[PDB]
Amino acid sequence: KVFGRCELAAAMKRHGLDNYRGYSLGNWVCAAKFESNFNTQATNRNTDGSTDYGILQINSRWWCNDGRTPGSRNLCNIPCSALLSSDITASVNCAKKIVSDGNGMNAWVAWRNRCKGTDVQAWIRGCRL
């Protein structure tokens, strides 16, 4: 599923991403835009055989089990396929654990490069939330 911008923002807000660990909602919407272009079925293989899954491109090395990444550890206790659903709950629940893991949102490279330091309010412009 490909979300609209404000559509995604509302679902993220529902699940309490707005201001979560001090990151306003626009950070998360921006992250989703540049990690997945709002596509829940996005996947990106990493060079090491691990794979980033879903709307927030959560990586299989540590966070989910795909049965095909080195080391598997599965800190979110989910199959990686759950991160590919049209409903963002698994992705959001896992994101909350990742952002509390000692580097804040820097764990998302696309956020770091395209969102960090910016006027993120743009990402929730026009939403009725």
CATH number at residue 74: 1.10.530.10
- Would you name the residues annotated as active-site residues? 35, 52
Through-space distance between the first and last CA atoms of the chain, rounded to whole angstroms? 21
Cross-sheet strand order for the sheet of 58-59: 43-45, 51-53, 58-59
Contact 94, 84 (CB under 8 A): no
Domain count, the chain: 1
Cα–Cα distance for residue pair 49/99, rounded to 1 Å: 23
Cα–Cα distance for residue pair 115/97, rounded to 1 Å: 20
Angstrom resolution of this structure: 1.8
Residues annotated within a binding site: 101
- Residue among 11, 32, 18 nearest 111 (CA): 32
Residues annotated within a binding site for substrate: 101
- Residue among 31, 44, 1, 22 nearest 110 (CA): 31
Contact 41, 84 (CB under 8 A): yes
Residue ranges making up the domain that contains 123: 1-129
Experimental method reported for this structure: X-ray
Beta strand extents in the chain (DSSP E only)? 43-45, 51-53, 58-59
